[PDB]
PDB file of N, CA and C in Angstrom:
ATOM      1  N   UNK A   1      20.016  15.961 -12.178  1.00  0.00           N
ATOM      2  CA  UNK A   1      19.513  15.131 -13.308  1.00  0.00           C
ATOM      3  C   UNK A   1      20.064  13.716 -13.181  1.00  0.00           C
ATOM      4  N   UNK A   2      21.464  13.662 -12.348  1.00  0.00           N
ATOM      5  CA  UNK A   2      21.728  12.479 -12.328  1.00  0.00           C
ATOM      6  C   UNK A   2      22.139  11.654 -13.728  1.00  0.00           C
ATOM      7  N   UNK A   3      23.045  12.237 -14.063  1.00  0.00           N
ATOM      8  CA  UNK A   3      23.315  11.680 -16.073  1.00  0.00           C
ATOM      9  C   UNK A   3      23.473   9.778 -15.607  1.00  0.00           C
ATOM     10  N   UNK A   4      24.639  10.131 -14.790  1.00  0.00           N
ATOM     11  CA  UNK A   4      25.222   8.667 -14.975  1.00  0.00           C
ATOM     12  C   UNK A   4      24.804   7.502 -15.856  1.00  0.00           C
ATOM     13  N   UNK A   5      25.433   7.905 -17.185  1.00  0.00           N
ATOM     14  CA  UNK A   5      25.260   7.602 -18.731  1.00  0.00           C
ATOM     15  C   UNK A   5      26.580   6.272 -18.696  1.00  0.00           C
ATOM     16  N   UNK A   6      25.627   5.189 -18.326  1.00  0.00           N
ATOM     17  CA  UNK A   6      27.017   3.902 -18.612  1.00  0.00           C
ATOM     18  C   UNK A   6      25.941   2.157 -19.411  1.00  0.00           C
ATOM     19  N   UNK A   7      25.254   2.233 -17.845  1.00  0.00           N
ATOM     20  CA  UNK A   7      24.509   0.779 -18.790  1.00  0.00           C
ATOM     21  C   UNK A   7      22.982   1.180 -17.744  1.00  0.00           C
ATOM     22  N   UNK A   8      22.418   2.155 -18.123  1.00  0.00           N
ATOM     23  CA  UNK A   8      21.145   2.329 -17.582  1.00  0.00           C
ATOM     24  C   UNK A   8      19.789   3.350 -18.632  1.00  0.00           C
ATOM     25  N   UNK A   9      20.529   2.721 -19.989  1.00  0.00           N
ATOM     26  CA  UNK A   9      19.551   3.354 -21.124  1.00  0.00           C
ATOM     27  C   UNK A   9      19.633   2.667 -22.612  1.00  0.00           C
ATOM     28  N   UNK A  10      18.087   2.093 -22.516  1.00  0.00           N
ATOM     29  CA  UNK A  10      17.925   1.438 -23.672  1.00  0.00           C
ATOM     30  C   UNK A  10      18.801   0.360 -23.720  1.00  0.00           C
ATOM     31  N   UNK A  11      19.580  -0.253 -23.070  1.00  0.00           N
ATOM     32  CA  UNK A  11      20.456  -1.323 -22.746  1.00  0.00           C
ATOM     33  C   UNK A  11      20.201  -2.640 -22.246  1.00  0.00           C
ATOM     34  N   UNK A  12      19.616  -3.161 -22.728  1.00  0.00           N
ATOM     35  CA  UNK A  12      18.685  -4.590 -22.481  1.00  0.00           C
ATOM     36  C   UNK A  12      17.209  -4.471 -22.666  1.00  0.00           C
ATOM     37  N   UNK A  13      16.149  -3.768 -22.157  1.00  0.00           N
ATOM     38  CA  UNK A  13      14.645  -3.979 -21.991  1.00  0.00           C
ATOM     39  C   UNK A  13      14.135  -2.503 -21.324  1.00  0.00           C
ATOM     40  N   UNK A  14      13.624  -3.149 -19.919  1.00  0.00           N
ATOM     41  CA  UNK A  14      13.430  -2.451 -19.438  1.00  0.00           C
ATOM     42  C   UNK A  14      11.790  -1.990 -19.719  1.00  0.00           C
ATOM     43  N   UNK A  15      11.195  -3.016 -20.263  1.00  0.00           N
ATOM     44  CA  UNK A  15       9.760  -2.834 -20.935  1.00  0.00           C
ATOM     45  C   UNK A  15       9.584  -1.362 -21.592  1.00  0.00           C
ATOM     46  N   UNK A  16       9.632  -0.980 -22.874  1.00  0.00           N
ATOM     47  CA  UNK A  16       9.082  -0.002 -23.205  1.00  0.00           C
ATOM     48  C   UNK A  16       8.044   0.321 -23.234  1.00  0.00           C
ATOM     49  N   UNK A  17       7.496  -0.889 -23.770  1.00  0.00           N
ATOM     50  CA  UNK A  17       6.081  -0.482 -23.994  1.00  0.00           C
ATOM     51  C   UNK A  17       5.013  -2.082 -24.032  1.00  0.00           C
ATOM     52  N   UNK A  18       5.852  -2.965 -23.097  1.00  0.00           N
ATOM     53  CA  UNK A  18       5.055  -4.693 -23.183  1.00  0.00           C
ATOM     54  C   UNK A  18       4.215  -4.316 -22.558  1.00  0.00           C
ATOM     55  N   UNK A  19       3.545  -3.550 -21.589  1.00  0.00           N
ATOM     56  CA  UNK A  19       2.290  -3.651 -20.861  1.00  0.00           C
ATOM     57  C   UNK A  19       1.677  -4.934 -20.972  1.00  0.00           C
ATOM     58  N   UNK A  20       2.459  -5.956 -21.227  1.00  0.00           N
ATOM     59  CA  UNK A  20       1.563  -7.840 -20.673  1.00  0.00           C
ATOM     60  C   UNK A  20       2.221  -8.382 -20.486  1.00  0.00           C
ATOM     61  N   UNK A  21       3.437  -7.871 -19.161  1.00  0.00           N
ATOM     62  CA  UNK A  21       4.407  -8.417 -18.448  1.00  0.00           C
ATOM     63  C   UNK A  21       3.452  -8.782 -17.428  1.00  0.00           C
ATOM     64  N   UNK A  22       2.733  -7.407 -16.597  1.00  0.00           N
ATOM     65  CA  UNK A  22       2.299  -7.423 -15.598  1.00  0.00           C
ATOM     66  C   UNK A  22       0.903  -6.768 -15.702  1.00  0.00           C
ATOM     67  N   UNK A  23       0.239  -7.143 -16.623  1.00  0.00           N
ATOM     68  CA  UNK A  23      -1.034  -6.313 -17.009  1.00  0.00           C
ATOM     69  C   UNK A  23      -1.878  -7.887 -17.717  1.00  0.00           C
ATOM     70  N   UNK A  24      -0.850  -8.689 -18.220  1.00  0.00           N
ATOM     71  CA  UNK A  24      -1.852  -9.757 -18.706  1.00  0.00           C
ATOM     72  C   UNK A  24      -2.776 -10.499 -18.197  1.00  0.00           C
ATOM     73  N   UNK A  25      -2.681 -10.136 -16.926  1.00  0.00           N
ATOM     74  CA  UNK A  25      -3.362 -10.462 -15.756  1.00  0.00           C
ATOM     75  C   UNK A  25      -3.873  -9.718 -14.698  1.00  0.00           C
ATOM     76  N   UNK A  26      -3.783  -8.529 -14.841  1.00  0.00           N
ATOM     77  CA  UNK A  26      -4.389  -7.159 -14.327  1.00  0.00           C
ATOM     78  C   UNK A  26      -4.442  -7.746 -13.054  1.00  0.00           C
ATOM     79  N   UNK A  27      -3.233  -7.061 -12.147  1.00  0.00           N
ATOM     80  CA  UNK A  27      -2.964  -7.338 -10.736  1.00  0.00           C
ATOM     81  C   UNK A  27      -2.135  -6.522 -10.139  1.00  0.00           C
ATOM     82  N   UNK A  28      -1.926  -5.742 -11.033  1.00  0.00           N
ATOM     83  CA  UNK A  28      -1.234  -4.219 -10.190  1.00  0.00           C
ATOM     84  C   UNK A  28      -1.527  -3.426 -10.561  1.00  0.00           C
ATOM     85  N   UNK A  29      -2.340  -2.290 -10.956  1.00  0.00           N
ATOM     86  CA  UNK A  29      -3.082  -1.613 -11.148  1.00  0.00           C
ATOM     87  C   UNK A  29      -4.195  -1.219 -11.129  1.00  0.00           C
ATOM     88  N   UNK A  30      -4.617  -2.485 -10.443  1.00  0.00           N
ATOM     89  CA  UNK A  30      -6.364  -1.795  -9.754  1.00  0.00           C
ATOM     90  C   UNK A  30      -5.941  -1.909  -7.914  1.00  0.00           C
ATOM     91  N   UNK A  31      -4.801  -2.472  -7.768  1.00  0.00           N
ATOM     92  CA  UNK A  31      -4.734  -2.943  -6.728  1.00  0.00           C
ATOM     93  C   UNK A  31      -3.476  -1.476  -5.525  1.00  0.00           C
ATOM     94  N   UNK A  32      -3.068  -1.435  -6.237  1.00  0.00           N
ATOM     95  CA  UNK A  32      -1.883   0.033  -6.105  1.00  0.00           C
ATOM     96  C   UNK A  32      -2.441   1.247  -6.260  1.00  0.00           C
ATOM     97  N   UNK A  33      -3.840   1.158  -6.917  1.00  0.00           N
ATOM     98  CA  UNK A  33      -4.746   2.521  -6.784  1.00  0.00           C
ATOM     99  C   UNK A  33      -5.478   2.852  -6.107  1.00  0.00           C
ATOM    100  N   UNK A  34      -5.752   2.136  -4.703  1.00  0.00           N
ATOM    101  CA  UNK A  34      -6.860   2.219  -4.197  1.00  0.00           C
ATOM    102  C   UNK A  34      -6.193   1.884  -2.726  1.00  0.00           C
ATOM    103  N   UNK A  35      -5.814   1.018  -2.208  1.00  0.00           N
ATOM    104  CA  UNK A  35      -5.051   0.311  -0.969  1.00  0.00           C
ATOM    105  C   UNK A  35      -4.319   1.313  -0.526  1.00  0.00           C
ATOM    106  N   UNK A  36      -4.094   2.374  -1.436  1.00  0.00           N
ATOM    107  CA  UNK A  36      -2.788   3.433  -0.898  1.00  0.00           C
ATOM    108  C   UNK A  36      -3.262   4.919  -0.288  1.00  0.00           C
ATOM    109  N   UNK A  37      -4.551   5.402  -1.059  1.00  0.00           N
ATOM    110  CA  UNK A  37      -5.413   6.545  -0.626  1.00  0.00           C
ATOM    111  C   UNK A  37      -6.460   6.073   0.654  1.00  0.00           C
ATOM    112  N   UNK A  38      -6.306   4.553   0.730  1.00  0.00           N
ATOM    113  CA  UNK A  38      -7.474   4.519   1.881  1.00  0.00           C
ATOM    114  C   UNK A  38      -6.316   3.745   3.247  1.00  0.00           C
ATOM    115  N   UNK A  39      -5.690   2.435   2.711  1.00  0.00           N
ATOM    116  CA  UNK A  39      -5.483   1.610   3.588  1.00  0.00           C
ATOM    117  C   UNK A  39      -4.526   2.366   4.448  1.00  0.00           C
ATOM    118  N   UNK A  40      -3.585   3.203   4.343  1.00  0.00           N
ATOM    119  CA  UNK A  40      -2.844   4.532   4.968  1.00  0.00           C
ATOM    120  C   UNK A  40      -3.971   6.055   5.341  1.00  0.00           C
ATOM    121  N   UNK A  41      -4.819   5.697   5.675  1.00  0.00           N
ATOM    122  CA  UNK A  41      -5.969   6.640   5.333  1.00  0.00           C
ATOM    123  C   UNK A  41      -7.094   7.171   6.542  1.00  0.00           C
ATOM    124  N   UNK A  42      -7.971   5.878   6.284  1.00  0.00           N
ATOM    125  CA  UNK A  42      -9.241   5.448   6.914  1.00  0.00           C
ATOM    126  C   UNK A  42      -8.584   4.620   8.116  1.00  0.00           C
ATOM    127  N   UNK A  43      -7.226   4.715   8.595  1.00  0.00           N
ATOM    128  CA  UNK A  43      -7.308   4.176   9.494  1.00  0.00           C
ATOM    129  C   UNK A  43      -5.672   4.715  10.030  1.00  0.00           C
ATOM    130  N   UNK A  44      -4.476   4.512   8.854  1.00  0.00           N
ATOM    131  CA  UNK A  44      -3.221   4.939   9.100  1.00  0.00           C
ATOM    132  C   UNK A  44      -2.607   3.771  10.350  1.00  0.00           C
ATOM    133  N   UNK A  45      -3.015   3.303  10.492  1.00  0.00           N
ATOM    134  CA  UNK A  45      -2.831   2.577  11.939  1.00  0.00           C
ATOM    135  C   UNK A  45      -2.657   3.269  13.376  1.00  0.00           C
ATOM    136  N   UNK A  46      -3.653   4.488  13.426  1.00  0.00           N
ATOM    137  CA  UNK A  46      -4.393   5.263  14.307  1.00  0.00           C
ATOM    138  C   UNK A  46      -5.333   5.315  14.736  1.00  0.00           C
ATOM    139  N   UNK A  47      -6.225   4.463  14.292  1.00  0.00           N
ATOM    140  CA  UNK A  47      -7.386   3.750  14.597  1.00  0.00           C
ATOM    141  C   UNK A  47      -7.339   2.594  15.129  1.00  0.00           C
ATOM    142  N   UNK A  48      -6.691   1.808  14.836  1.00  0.00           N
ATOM    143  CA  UNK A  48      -6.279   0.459  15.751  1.00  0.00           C
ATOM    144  C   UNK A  48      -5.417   0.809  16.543  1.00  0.00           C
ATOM    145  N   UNK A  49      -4.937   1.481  17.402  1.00  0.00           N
ATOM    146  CA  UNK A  49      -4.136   1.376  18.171  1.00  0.00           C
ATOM    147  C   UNK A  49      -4.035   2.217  18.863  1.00  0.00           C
ATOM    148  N   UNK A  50      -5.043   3.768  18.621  1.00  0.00           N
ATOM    149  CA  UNK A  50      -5.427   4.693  19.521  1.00  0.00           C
ATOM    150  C   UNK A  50      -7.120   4.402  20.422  1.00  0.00           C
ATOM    151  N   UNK A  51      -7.731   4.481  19.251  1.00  0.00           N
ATOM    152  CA  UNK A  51      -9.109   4.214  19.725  1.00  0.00           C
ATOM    153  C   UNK A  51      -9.469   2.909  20.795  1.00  0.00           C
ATOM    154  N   UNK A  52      -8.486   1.977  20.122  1.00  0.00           N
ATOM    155  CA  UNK A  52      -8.642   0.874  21.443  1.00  0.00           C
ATOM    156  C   UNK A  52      -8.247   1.469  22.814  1.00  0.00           C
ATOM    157  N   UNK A  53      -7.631   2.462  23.695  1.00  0.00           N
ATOM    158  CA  UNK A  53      -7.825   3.423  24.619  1.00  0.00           C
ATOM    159  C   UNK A  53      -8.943   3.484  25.331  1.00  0.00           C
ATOM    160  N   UNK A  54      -9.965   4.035  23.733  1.00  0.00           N
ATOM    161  CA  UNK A  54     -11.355   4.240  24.485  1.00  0.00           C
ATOM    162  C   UNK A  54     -12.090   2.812  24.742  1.00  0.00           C
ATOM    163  N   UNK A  55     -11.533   1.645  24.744  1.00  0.00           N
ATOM    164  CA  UNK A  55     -12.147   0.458  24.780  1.00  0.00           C
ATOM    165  C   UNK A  55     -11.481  -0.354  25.722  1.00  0.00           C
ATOM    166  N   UNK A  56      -9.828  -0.671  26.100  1.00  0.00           N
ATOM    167  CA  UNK A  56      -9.309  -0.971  26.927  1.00  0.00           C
ATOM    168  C   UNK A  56      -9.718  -1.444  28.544  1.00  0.00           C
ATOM    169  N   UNK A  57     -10.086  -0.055  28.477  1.00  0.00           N
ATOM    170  CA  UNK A  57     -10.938   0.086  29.562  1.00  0.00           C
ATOM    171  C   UNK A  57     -11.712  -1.145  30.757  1.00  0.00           C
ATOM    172  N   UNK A  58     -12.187  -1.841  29.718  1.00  0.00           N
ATOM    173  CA  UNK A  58     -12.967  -3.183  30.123  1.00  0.00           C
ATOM    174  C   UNK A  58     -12.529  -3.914  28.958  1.00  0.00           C
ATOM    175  N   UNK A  59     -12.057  -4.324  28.425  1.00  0.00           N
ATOM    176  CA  UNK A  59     -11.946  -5.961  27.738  1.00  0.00           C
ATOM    177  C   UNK A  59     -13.534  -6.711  27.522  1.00  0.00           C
ATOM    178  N   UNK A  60     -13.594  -6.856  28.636  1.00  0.00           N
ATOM    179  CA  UNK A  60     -15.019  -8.008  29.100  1.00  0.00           C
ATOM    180  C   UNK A  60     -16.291  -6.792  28.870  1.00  0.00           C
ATOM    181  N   UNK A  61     -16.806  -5.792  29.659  1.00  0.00           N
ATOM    182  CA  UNK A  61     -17.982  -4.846  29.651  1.00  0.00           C
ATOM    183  C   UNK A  61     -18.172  -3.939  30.896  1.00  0.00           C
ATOM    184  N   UNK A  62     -17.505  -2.921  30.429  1.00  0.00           N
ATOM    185  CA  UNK A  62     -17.966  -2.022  31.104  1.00  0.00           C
ATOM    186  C   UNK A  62     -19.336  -1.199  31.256  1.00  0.00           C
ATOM    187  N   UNK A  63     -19.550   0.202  31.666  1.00  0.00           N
ATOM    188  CA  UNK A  63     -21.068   0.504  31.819  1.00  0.00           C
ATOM    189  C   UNK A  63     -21.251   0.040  32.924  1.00  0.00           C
ATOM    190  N   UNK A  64     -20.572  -0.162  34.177  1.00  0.00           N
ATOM    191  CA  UNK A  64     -21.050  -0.652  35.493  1.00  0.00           C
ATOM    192  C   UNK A  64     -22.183  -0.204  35.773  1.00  0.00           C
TER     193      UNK A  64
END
């Protein structure tokens, strides 16, 4: 549980409930929902950097 009960509750802020710290401008939350299921995803960086393999090959054009 981790108590460690000293200065880490209710002790300054800590936004309870401002939701228009970082919402008054809606810029993390459409943006942290979506970038994370695809951009690690649809590609993982296994696609750039495997598949070029099958392309390497020729640079310029292969198909001799």
């Amino acid at each position: 549980m981790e108590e460690g009960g000293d200065f880490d509750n209710y002790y300054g802020a800590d936004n309870q409930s401002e939701c228009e710290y970082t919402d008054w401008k809606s810029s993390g939350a459409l943006i942290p929902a979506i970038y994370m299921l695809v951009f690690l995803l649809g590609t993982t960086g296994n696609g750039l950097v495997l598949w070029t393999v099958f392309r390497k090959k020729g640079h310029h054009h292969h198909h001799h």
